[PDB]
Amino acid sequence: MDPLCAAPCSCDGDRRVDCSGKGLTAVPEGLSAFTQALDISMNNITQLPEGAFKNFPFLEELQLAGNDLSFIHPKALSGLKELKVLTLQNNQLKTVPSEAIRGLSALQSLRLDANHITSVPEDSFEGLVQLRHLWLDDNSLTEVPVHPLSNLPTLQALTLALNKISSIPDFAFTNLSSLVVLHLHNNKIRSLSQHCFDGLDNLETLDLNYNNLGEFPQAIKALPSLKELALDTNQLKSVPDGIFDRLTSLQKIWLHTNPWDCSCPRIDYLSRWLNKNSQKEQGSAKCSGSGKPVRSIICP
Amino acid sequence: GCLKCSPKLFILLERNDIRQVGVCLPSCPPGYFDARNPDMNKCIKCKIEHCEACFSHNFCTKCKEGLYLHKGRCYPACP
């Protein structure tokens, strides 16, 4: 009993349409203009033509994950002024579709994870004045997209995890004043510039684990709201003295699976801090060689 | 059940029996998020109480009806 539907989708009376997993190559014809949510994930849509969603002016949620989408017409998404959620994960995108999403002024959540994105055009994310959540994980980015990210002061959640980023320059995230969580784990970051995190005044969670950090990130000093800091599974040998003095918001820190050099007086400050702040360390930082916990070390 | 999924999908672990059963999924059920990994993608429970969809374990994107979302957390009234 779907008065406003078309084969082989379902229309669940709350103006949500489900056409997922149906072997579709296109948006089905004859769907209602009342539609508020459209799930067309897990099909075989490789291309979206112009005006593909022209008859859905009140669409709030569009699920396109798991297709094999490799081409989005610059005007495929025209007229979707109400759209809040766009999921494009697990497709064949090579480029962030900058122009096609430009008019999505109500968008709050954008999933671009698990594509094959190697580049993000400079003008990406202009027009996304309400965006809150952005997933860019599991792509092929080799750098942080600085100018495109500068367009998103409303952004709260960002993942750039599982990409190929090797360094982050000064002021890379400077306009992201609302950002609460930032994931940068599973990249190949060896170089963090001294001021790469400036302007992240609301940041609570920072994940930098599974990288190639050889030097401790001084840049973390610019994070007054920092609650959770993951630095596990890097190549860290020492921390600079007094690095945590101004991180009075810290609640959890991961330091394990790093080759800590437990020579005195180099390990002095870190050993004492870990002993005074035992409640904050998650797991155990160990001395390279012996495997003795860093907190158990004392310098005379 | 299934032990390794197709390279993109997520394993959900169940103990409906007294055995551990896996099932492969394109997304994850409500209360769970898609944790992407180099080795194995899995569904993991959100750590936020009364969260229906989440970005990560400590950041909710959709609270239970009647609750208020603020900075990834669910509140019984607007903060």
How far is the C-alpha of A249 from the C-alpha of A225, rounded, in Å?
A: 6
**Angle at the Cα of A114 from the Cα atoms of A57 and A227, rounded to 5 degrees:** 95
Residues in A closer than 8 angstroms to B24, CB to CB, are: none
Structural domain span for residue A54: 1-300
A157:B36 CB<8 A: no
Number of domains in chain A: 1
Residue to mutate among B59, B62, B73, with most A CBs inside 10 A, is B59
CATH of B1-79, one of 3.40.50.720, 1.10.10.10, 2.10.220.10, 3.40.50.1220: 2.10.220.10
Select from A199, A207, A190, A241 the least CA-distant residue to A224. A199
State both tokens at A280: 């904050």
Size of interface A-B (CB pairs under 8 A): 48
How far is the C-alpha of A53 from the C-alpha of B65, rounded, in Å?
A: 29
This entry's atomic model was obtained through: X-ray
The kind and range of the H/E element at A122 are: none
Indicate the domain borders of chain B.
Answer: 1-79
Residue to mutate among A93, A136, A138, A139, with most B CBs inside 10 A, is A138
How far is the C-alpha of A215 from the C-alpha of B20, rounded, in Å?
A: 42
How far is the C-alpha of B51 from the C-alpha of B30, rounded, in Å?
A: 8
- Kind of pairing between the strands at A16-18 and A10-11: antiparallel
How far is the C-alpha of A266 from the C-alpha of A297, rounded, in Å?
A: 11
Q: What is the DSSP string of A156-184?
A: -EEE--SS---EE-TTTTTT-TT--EEE-
How far is the C-alpha of A178 from the C-alpha of A156, rounded, in Å?
A: 5
Select from A114, A130, A241, A110 the least CA-distant residue to A178. A130
Quoted resolution (Å): 2.2
Select from A293, A246, A248, A231 the least CA-distant residue to A267. A293
Residues 6+ positions from A126 with CB-CB distance below 8 Å: A98, A102, A148, A151
Name the DSSP letter for residue B30: T
